Structure formats: structure tokens, C-alpha cells
Amino acid sequence: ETIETFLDGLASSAPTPGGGGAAAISGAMGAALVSMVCNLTIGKKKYVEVEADLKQVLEKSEGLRRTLTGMIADDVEAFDAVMGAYGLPKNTDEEKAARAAKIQEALKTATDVPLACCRVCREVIDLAEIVAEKGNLNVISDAGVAVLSAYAGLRSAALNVYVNAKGLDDRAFAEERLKELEGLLAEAGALNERIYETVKSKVN
Amino acid sequence: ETIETFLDGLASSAPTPGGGGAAAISGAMGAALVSMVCNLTIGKKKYVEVEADLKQVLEKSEGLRRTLTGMIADDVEAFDAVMGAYGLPKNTDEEKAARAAKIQEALKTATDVPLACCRVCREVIDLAEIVAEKGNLNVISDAGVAVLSAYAGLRSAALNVYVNAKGLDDRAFAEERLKELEGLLAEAGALNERIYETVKSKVN
């Protein structure tokens, strides 16, 4: 899909793509920029001490980028399934029961997907940190864009987890997913500002 | 250009696409999600007191969307021009003088392009605040994603302002742009957390 077409879809009254899709894109760009800093530090003679560490980082970030790029489509199809299920008919007892059950199972999927996106964005913040410490100083600004895009991705997906978890009958499933989410948010809140500041400082 | 082709380019050792390209996309997705909330609130029986204000928001957000989508290529062009200017030959005295002129010109344009992306992202945050207060409660999460995505874009472009402003001979030019950037950053910092918190609280 074209960036312009995606953006036209996002802006429209089409329920997909939505915030979940944009979240995965924020994450993917974060993963990509970590990979860029690695690719532009590996080889450089001044940066031999970190080359092996950054080849490992590049390995994981390229992994995270593939996953997060896939997650754009996962969130779109997860949220289409939710709208699908709200649109089933509700004339009879049996239909009302089928509809309610299918809504619940779509909601569950549309909670796990943004939550998965949160986990991968949290890992991108960890790699953003390393390339902020070790990266080629000429391109260090890209480590700062990576952490901001990843943190945007994380808190964007988090809102999707909150709004979906609230509609679930299974309170054990919901409360387990919220507790994980809170810990990912609290960790990322502590690191995001510090990594930005390290980059802001090296930039000036 | 496809999201996947952009992401492949972003990750590679090519100096573009870079942090500044990503910043424009972050800003563009922010504007799109403001439009989306407007499109899913306008024509709703329950939201008529606000239908008037939200048609003026749609008009503005659809405008900012168009500008930030164009800024993806503007930022690619501006930074390619910086890299291209450092790589010009120094074989004659006229070449050396032309190269030093073209480096300063490219640094100037590569400071104004990201500063423009910061101004537009700062306006997307004001529009996101309005849709957080007045938008359809069913899609209020997307007002959250819009502000996070716009804030990420503002601060991403800000780092590129800092990186390019540091190479400029013209300190009047650098210091006016830096003074204006500091205003946009201090305002957006204050507003981002409060709009996020409004949306979060209205989610549950």
C-alpha cells in the first residue's frame, strides 16, 4: 500500500486503517532508524570497539522491523473482525448469543494485537538506547527519532489495548493484559526521555 | 512509494530516507487521525452542538495532512542536497567557493524544512486537543494516537533542526530558528501529556 493511499484510508470514515495501524508504523520506523544507525556505524574505523555489539543490534532491529511491518495488517484485520462482529444480525436469542460471543473473541484478538505491538516497541526502545550510546555521532539524531517513533508506537497501541480490554466479559484475560501493559508503559516512560536527552546532548 | 519500500530505504545505509522523512510521516498520520475522528463525528444526531467547530477542524486537518505528506519528499531532497554539497569537487578555486556556498545553502534549507514540519505538527496538536474534547466517544482513542504521532514528529524534526543549525556560519539565522523551535517544543511538551491523559481517562 502507498504512503499516500494508507494516509487517505487513515483520514477517512473507514474504521480501518485506524490508530492501531499508525502505531505499528511508528514502531516499524523506530526499528528501521536503529538499523540505519547500525548500518552507518559498522565499518567506520573510529567505531571498531562497538562493531560486534552493533552487528547483533542490527540483527534484532531488522527482526523487529519485519514483525512490526506485519503488525500493520494484523491490526487492520483484527479491527475489521470487530466491526464485522458488531454487524452480525441480532433477531433471535441464538443470533444474539452468536453475535455477543463473536464480538468478545474479536475484542480479545484486537487487545492481543496492539499488546504484541507494545512489546516489540518496548524492545525497539532498548535497541534505540544502545545505538544512542554507541552509534556514529554524525548520524546520532536518528537514534533520537527511533526512540520517539517507538514510544509513540507503544502509547498509541496502549490506548487500543485500553479501549478493547474495557469491553471484555473475561476479566481475568483483561486484567492480565492490562497488568503487562502498565509495566511496559512505566519502563518506556522512564527510558524515552533519558534516551532523547542523550541524543539531544550529543547533537549539541 | 510503498510503506515497505520506504521502511527498506529508511533502514539501509542510504542517508535518505532519514529521521526527517519519518518525522513528516508521524505528523501526517497525526493529521489523518484528526480528520478520521471528524469524519466519524460529523453527521451524528448526538454531536450537533460541535458539528460546526468539527467541520472547521476537518478543513484545517485535511490541509495539514496534504502539507506534511509533501514534506516527506522535501526532507529527502533537503538532506540529499547536504550530502551532495559535502561531496562536490574542490579541483579549482571557483569549485571550492561554490562547494562552501552550496554547503551553507543546503544547511539553511535543511534547517527550514524540518522547522516547517515542527510548525505544522504544533498545529496538529491544537487540532487533536479539539477532537479529544468534542469528538465521538466511540473513536476517542484515535485523538490520542493523533497527538502522540504529532508530538513524535515535532520532536523528531526538532533534532534535525538542531543538527543542521550547528553547521551554519549565519548565527542570526541559526539563533532565530532555534528561538522559534524552543517555543514550539515547550508548548507541545505541556499539551501532549494533558491531551493524552484526557483521551486515556475518557477510554476507561
Grid cell 552550496 in the structure block, residue: B102
- Supply A169's cell numbers: 466479559
Query: b/e per residue, B24-51, with b = 16+ CB within 10 A?
Result: bbbbbbbbbbbbbbbbbbbeeeebeebe
Residues 6+ apart with CB under 8 A from A144: A132, A195, A196, A199, A200, A203, B19, B155, B156, B159
First CA to last CA distance, chain B? 38
- Supply A98's cell numbers: 452468536
Q: How many CB atoms lie within 10 A of CB A77?
A: 13
Closest CA to B81 of B109, B55, B57: B109
B201 Cβ under 8 Å from any chain A Cβ: no
Peptide bond into A114 cis (omega under 30): no
**Helices (H) and strands (E) in chain B — how many of each?**
6, 0
Which SS3 state, helix, strand or coil, does residue B136 take?
A: coil
Instruction: Round to whole Å and give the CA distance between A41 and A4.
Output: 32
* Helix A141-165 and helix A19-39, axial crossing angle in degrees, nearest 10: 150
Instruction: Round to whole Å and give the CA distance between B162 and B92.
Output: 32
| CB-closest option in A19, A32, A156 to B10 | A32
CB A10 within 8 A of CB B69: no
Grid cell 509495566 in the structure block, residue: A183
**Residue B66 class from Cβ within 10 Å (0-12 exposed, 13-18 middle, 19+ buried)?**
middle
Instruction: Round to whole Å and give the CA distance between A20 and B90.
Output: 50
Residues 6+ apart with CB under 8 A from B43: B51
CA A188 to chain centre: 12
CB B96 within 8 A of CB B170: no
Peptide bond into A89 cis (omega under 30): no
How many C-alpha atoms does A199 have within 13 Å on its Cβ side? Answer: 34
What method was applied to determine this entry? Answer: X-ray
Q: What residues are paired with B2 via a beta bridge?
A: A2
**What values do phi and psi take at B56, rounded to 5?**
-70, -35
A198 Cβ under 8 Å from any chain B Cβ: no
- Supply B42's cell numbers: 460529523
Instruction: Round to whole Å and give the CA distance between A139 and B128.
Output: 31
Please tell me what DSSP assigns to residue A2.
Answer: B
Q: Do B31 and A11 touch (CB under 8 A)?
A: yes
Residue type present at position A144:
G
CB A41 within 8 A of CB A127: no
- Supply B122's cell numbers: 504544533
**Residues of B whose CB is below 8 A from A33:** 10-11, 18-19, 22
Task: Transcribe A162-187 into DSSP letters.
Answer: HHHHTT-S-HHHHHHHHHHHHHHHHH
Q: Do A141 and B23 touch (CB under 8 A)?
A: no
CB A85 within 8 A of CB A103: yes
Task: Transcribe A93-121 into DSSP letters.
Answer: HHHHHHHHHHHHHHHHHHHHHHHHHHHHH
Grid cell 548565527 in the structure block, residue: B171
Q: With a CB-CB cutoff of 8 Å, which residues 24-53 of chain A face chain B?
A: 25-26, 28-29, 31-33, 35-36, 39-40
Instruction: Determine the Cα angle at B153 with ends B148 and B155, to 5°.
Output: 95
Q: How many CB atoms lie within 10 A of CB A47?
A: 16
B195 Cβ under 8 Å from any chain A Cβ: no
Q: How many CB atoms lie within 10 A of CB A119?
A: 14
Grid cell 540483527 in the structure block, residue: A59
Residues 6+ apart with CB under 8 A from B40: A13, B135, B136, B138, B139
CA dihedral A141, A196, A6, B198 (to 10 degrees): -160
CB B19 within 8 A of CB B159: yes
Grid cell 542490527 in the structure block, residue: A58
Residues 6+ apart with CB under 8 A from A52: none
Which SS3 state, helix, strand or coil, does residue A44 take?
A: coil
Q: In units of Å, what resolution does this entry have?
A: 2.2
Chain A closest-CA separation from residue B37 CA (Å)? 8
Chain B closest-CA separation from residue A29 CA (Å)? 7
Q: How many CB atoms lie within 10 A of CB B150?
A: 34
CB A19 within 8 A of CB B149: no
Task: Transcribe B90-156 into DSSP letters.
Answer: -SSHHHHHHHHHHHHHHHHHHHHHHHHHHHHHHHHHHHHHHHHHHS-GGGHHHHHHHHHHHHHHHHH
- Supply A165's cell numbers: 480490554
- Per domain, the residue ranges of chain B are 1-204
**What values do phi and psi take at A42, rounded to 5?**
-60, 130
| CB-closest option in A2, A18, A144 to B2 | A2
Distances (CA, A) of A188 to A110, A118, A134, B112: 22, 10, 20, 31
Instruction: Round to whole Å and give the CA distance between A88 and A76.
Output: 19
Q: Do B32 and A23 touch (CB under 8 A)?
A: no
Instruction: Determine the Cα angle at B11 with ends B181 and A133, to 5°.
Output: 65
CB A202 within 8 A of CB A154: no
Closest CA to B32 of B70, B68, B5: B68
Instruction: Round to whole Å and give the CA distance between B175 and B166.
Output: 10
